[PDB]
């Protein structure tokens, strides 16, 4: 899995921010606080060797004339009386646990920042991605991917920095104390012991996982069975109630109670050998030291430190055994996330950027063909020309697939062989931002976020004052229905708020697009059915809004939009008729039947 | 909360099964394996005091003429050479960890059995409960209650037996070692220390919980916000994409990154004071022992055991601090479960039990009134008499609420002021089992469990042979459609199986009630709409089945069931018309309009 190492490389690439000097200093401090602690925690038993001696010298009849043999602690520190050394022992160990605990605090303000930068970058890249990717993927999946990946990053960094590195620095240093009070043969025994212990725990965890999975399977089966059985209460009650039902549930719970009694004996074998494997080490160490003591070796009274060193090693070893499943799962979730990234968008623009300079809006289509799939090609050469400042209507059946128009004009999908003339300019060259900003559109379904009305009504253009939004309201003719707001026009809307019917939601859409003050207006049959009183007035409002801007309206219903200058009949995904509606009715064409059946 | 102690009393009541001798023996063995371990784990440092001595006697110039002062270990055990004592140390501690681990295995085969008995009893009591309780309560809730309660029982028993009892036996015994090498003042210091440590950890955990809740709130808010934002991609894309959106998500993730950086410093204070509070104890103990050593007290070289005893106490203390939330939550979930139990069913029967001896079925209703709610009383004195072996039809509108009939005849709900004559007998006296067994009914919706066809087809009466189910199939006329089964008539059905249409499901219902061979047949308009070919034949089949048994059919549609002898019109929950259908059509009554609009 070479790509897995590559993913680690990417993680290192993102982790290190050269740009800012402070980050490096933070990391350095962290490392310092990781070393200091782990050397005080070895000073602790050396202080317990020093305090066992001198105590024995007095009353014990130990040779007092040994002066200061080692001469390493010749400093007057902790030599006032033996009680001082014991106090130093306590202070030392407490300070070690302080340094080590402090390191975590120093390194979490770094971990959080890393997670934040990766998540923000992924978010922005996601929105940059083209529509096709979003449509194919499931909405829930994106959530799962981001949350699990961020959690995985946090877990892996904490697991490594706080567990893998301290354990190995500890073991290496302890075995590296071979310079003093040690022999070459003696040092290897502890390393071999700990290596065997780690191998045994890691190997037996794999075995444990199978039993855990079997138990989860059985438990889920029993629960689902007893829920299916409870749900279908009526059938059971009518005839032979709980006659043969309880016995069957009993059998399921016997299978569960056996698959659960098995895992205990399996954990038992591990939790026993995890003791014996580490006890043989301590027995071997002590018996070997005793032989030296009784054989007149330099070792005198220093047996008491070995217990301490072994205890220090014994504490954090257990964590390493159980990290395998988490590591593999996190390391594949991280590949998932970093695979979501680095996916290029289909709709690339050319290098040179030219801004859309549109004096007046003219829509000219020239043999635009587009097939979503090879079998069915939606548009088969639609060509029409809209005069500036006029209204043109696109009508047809629902099979005609007139949804594409909006997607194409917004450059969601590109044309296989055609062009789009905007004020006699080619869209392929102009910047995406300039075009999407200069065009105005009203959505078909007006989804509102959960926030204050004033935010959902100034959303169209930010930096909107209260007077601007007021003038938009007045033209939107919403003041009659807005003075009843419970929170003086700040009432919360959306979920956990006042539910809005379609008419007000449409008014909100109008009072959101009126703010933007666009150059061209495009509609997508916002309302399918509505009360007559609201329809008429909203139609008048949108007619007034569209008076100074060239507009294009796509309406499945005919009577709804008859006010345009020309009407483009669309049937079987091609241009059928181009004229004012009256001779369309008089041509016995598609428009004629559709309208004559709309009124009937 | 006196009732909480009462709940503990109930738990003790259920835990102890006097009936079986083996259970007590198991529990006794468990307790033994809980004592032995916890006394070997105190033998361990005594063996490390014994091995520190004698080693010092040689080469150390220790007085060899002290003979055997204590005379407690005068046994020749572990006196071959000092190496033997070290080996004994290792073997002892390993054996302690074996005994203690073994206890868990011995006590889990008891815990599982307890959980099983409580769950099975609750299940049966649940099914015993009347319909009203089931209808009011939510189906999901019952699941949640059972699963959480069983988990709580397991957690509380394991938590107490494995943690609370060992910790207190350990502490009490250690402080109880006051007989040897101790003073009255010295013993109290350790108890005061550990008591202060437990108080500090418990108190500061409450504080930690508030920060954890704030963090969970903030995390959920950030996630829900970013999902709402991702979902509404279109609105964002049309205008000012990620212009002001990213900054707002950023602010949410700043709030999260602060509420998460706060909890670390809060945990930090706990994880530091949990060290200093326990370090002051060790420093005080050692300095006090050193004063004795230097003052010519009996204590000689036994300082090395105190470290071990303190370490043994230090290991399992941490668990007790975090158990508060789990204990309170489990202790209230247990009250939930034991509150579900001991709820009596409304439909009690009288003491004396008389069996239903029905020579022939005669249905006689006499002024039966029943109101589900005081406002609307469904039945207002329905009285009619069915002759034996005949077919009678109950017809009406959907507002007439004719659903009650089935519930009442099955004695789901009792009559406020009326009686039901079954073969000239009163239902109130006869046993519920006898009546519900002697009556036959076909369900309206035929829910099938996920199992083999042969099980879903012999379900009506257990102990059904292959020939019995074959004859039921032949009369059910299902052999034509059954020889196509992929698994030679053992094909799985239900979910994750072959989906069945309404016609086959109805055939299954017929081939389930035909098995039971009841004395009286009752229908509940099983089919609302179906293909003509199946309807006709299934009607013929049910006519043949009902020929020898008196039958009652409730049909909302009129043309569907015209074959009965008499027809009972029901309108506004009262008997309107009683006759053969032809003069019902000729009476211009409810039946006449209903049928004339069914055919139109």
Author numbering:
A (entry chain B), B (entry chain A): 117 to 716
What do the study's own words say?
The ATP binding cassette (ABC) transporter of mitochondria (Atm) from Arabidopsis thaliana (AtAtm3) has been implicated in the maturation of cytosolic iron-sulfur proteins and heavy metal detoxification, plausibly by exporting glutathione derivatives. Structures for Atm family members are currently available for ScAtm1, the bacterial homolog NaAtm1 from Novosphingobium aromaticivorans and human ABCB6; the pairwise sequence identities between these homologous transporters range from 40% to 46%. These proteins occur as homodimers of half-transporters, where each half-transporter contains a transmembrane domain (TMD) followed by the canonical nucleotide binding domain (NBD) that defines the ABC transporter family. The translocation of substrates across the membrane proceeds through an alternating access mechanism involving the ATP-dependent interconversion between inward- and outward-facing conformational states. Using single-particle cryo-electron microscopy, we have determined four structures of AtAtm3 in three different conformational states: two inward-facing conformations (with and without bound oxidized glutathione [GSSG]), together with closed and outward-facing states stabilized by MgADP-VO4.
We first determined the structure of AtAtm3 reconstituted in nanodiscs at 3.4 Å resolution in the absence of either nucleotide or transport substrate. The primary distinction between these structures is the presence of an approximately 20 amino acid loop between TM1 and TM2 of AtAtm3 that would be positioned in the intermembrane space and is absent from the structures of ABCB7, ABCB6, ScAtm1, and NaAtm1. While the functional relevance of this loop in AtAtm3 is not known, structural characterization of PglK, a lipid-linked oligosaccharide flippase, revealed a comparably positioned external helix between TM1 and TM2 that was implicated in substrate flipping, suggestive that the corresponding loop could also have a functional or structural role in AtAtm3. As previously noted with NaAtm1, the TM6s in these inward-facing structures of AtAtm3 adopt a kinked conformation including residues 429–438. The TM6 helical kink in the closed conformation is adjacent to, but distinct from, the helical kink present at residues 429–438 in the inward-facing conformation. In contrast to differences in the structures of the TMDs between the closed and outward-facing conformations, the TMDs in the inward-facing conformation structures of AtAtm3 are similar. The primary differences between the two structures of inward-facing conformations of AtAtm3 are in the relative positioning of the NBDs which are more widely separated in the apo structure relative to the GSSG-bound structure.
